Amino acid sequence: FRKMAFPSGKVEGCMVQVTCGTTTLNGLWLDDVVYCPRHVICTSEDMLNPNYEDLLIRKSNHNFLVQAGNVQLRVIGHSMQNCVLKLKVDTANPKTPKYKFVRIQPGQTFSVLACYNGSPSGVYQCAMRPNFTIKGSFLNGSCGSVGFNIDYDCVSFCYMHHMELPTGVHAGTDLEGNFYGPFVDRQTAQAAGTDTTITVNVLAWLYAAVINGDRWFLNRFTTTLNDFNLVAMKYNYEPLTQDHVDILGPLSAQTGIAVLDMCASLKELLQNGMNGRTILGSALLEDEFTPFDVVRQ
Amino acid sequence: FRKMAFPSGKVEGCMVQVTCGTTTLNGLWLDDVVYCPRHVICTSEDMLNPNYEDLLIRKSNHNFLVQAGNVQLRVIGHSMQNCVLKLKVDTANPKTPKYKFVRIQPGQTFSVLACYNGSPSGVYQCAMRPNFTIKGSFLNGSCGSVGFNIDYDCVSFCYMHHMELPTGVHAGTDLEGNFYGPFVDRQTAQAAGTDTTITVNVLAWLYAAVINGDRWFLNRFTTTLNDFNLVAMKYNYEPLTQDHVDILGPLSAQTGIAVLDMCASLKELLQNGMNGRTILGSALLEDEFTPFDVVRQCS
């Protein structure tokens, strides 16, 4: 049982390179608009407190170089919506897929197409964490890489990459330019809130381990929902809501392990640890697989 | 560090479905040829004990249905090459990328585009285990899905999916139809060899740790490849080859640490344990990232 990303071709056809001054990053070309992080217009002289509205009005369309492979796209207008710069271009992208912009909830997952200089480099699954960070693999030049899910033929874009935090995790925005979490597009060291663990996902992953014939962590004990939640919170896990208990019904039915029995097993794991054993090859409890991600596998 | 696949679009544009009778699986359409597992010509009962030469001689071009989505590609020739069927079709694929067919070595990683009915479902990174199996998410109808790497703009195709073993792991061929490992495309119980840890990839992981400033485990001393191999086998680690030493070259140059010096460091870790310490934050040594993967994610 491994993470699986969506096929990335529909998104690859939308990636372009955007340069302003000496800063190059990636943009997303949908119809006649290129979306990218607005920090492309900041410089080392103003990055600690960039007055983006003042910077933006002082730019001309010709200050923005947009390259789609071999072709330069002509910028015919520029504006910003929150932290996303929108460059209107004179050509609609002929590879624009059916798409929507969504804001994802913490605990949900998405695929990331990591890009550098407008070129797709890698694809992998990420979770929006409760503290609104993501554990990406984003290096220099990755800004403007996007996160998405695919439903039928429709690409739902939910993330655009802007920054790294001193702990090595990442922060960014939805495609309306609003950050996930309390982060700001200035060049400062920003800490996140406490990194609470996605309990319903850990449980889903324990069900996945059982489906794959790993059973060593199960116990006969049970627990009430509140007694589980008291221990979960002691360990900086999310309390399990009734909606989340419901979401786990399929896996519970499939395995014949009631949700609260799996909670009792997780409680035992939190209090004792794994005593040098592994689950699905991991010495750590994994919380980036949703119940949905598990079922479809 | 995380498993990262290559972008799949160049391969998505080459996936088709191939049907014989009611048996449907995926194929790969490059120029005017479609490549797919030869067991497409089998009924389910034929798969228990197939005579492929006899099955194939009973087939004509007009018995093969190739579809790109709902669009039929007429078959104008057919041949069998080892365990792959090659169907010549009337249309050259306009989306054919620059490509090569490569036969990988165990320990190497590659991306799989898991496909059903010629439609891509998901993409993920796999390591070929030393026993020539892969740990895939392959459900029924996934045969003919391919594994690949992308270098520059060139797609190197290295794997085509054929079968599941009793243990739940998977087996397949290169794009010339030769199986990886001692497997045959017959629905018979077959066992893989005992799996072992991919030593070259553990060494790449130790080099990655050094690159990130985590170097408490470095030995002052060096060993020979033979001494290392004889010890490593006692810990269920794969013996190193000269090609493994060679692919560690860039990481050895980046760190200034000779491959055989890192081997002596790993030997000491196997013999003495971690003694409570961690490497890259982990008490376990990781074997799923190649030297190339380490460079891709550290640089």
UniProtKB/Swiss-Prot annotation, chain B:
Annotated catalysed reactions: TSAVLQ-|-SGFRK-NH2 and SGVTFQ-|-GKFKK the two peptides corresponding to the two self-cleavage sites of the SARS 3C-like proteinase are the two most reactive peptide substrates. The enzyme exhibits a strong preference for substrates containing Gln at P1 position and Leu at P2 position
Activity regulation info: Inhibited by pyridone-containing alpha-ketoamides compounds 13a and 13b. In turn, alpha-ketoamide 13b (tert-butyl (1-((S)-1-(((S)-4-(benzylamino)-3,4-dioxo-1-((S)-2-oxopyrrolidin-3-yl)butan-2-yl)amino)-3-cyclopropyl-1-oxopropan-2-yl)-2-oxo-1,2-dihydropyridin-3-yl)carbamate) inhibits SARS-CoV-2 replication in human lung cells. Inhibited ex vivo by michael acceptor inhibitor N3. Inhibited ex vivo by compound 11a and 11b.
Subcellular location per the Swiss-Prot or TrEMBL entry: Host cytoplasm; Host Golgi apparatus; Host nucleus
Domain Peptidase C30 residues, every copy: 1-299
Topology, Cytoplasmic side: 1-299
Catalytic residues of the enzyme: H39, C143
Resulting phenotype, C143A: Complete loss of 3C-like proteinase nsp5 cleavage
Free-text function comment from the UniProt entry: Cleaves the C-terminus of replicase polyprotein at 11 sites. Recognizes substrates containing the core sequence [ILMVF]-Q-|-[SGACN]. Cleaves and inactivates human TRMT1, preventing tRNA guanine(26)-dimethylation of tRNAs. May cleave human NLRP1 in lung epithelial cells, thereby activating the NLRP1 inflammasome pathway. May cleave human GSDMD, triggering alternative GSDME-mediated epithelial cell death upon activation of the NLRP1 inflammasome, which may enhance the release interleukins 1B, 6, 16 and 18. Also able to bind an ADP-ribose-1''-phosphate (ADRP).
Subunit structure: 3CL-PRO exists as monomer and homodimer. Only the homodimer shows catalytic activity. Interacts with host FBXO22; this interaction promotes the proteasomal degradation of nsp5.
Name of the featured protein: 3C-like proteinase nsp5
Annotated organism of origin: Severe acute respiratory syndrome coronavirus 2
Gene behind the chain: rep
Residues of the full protein shown: 3266 to 3564 of 7096
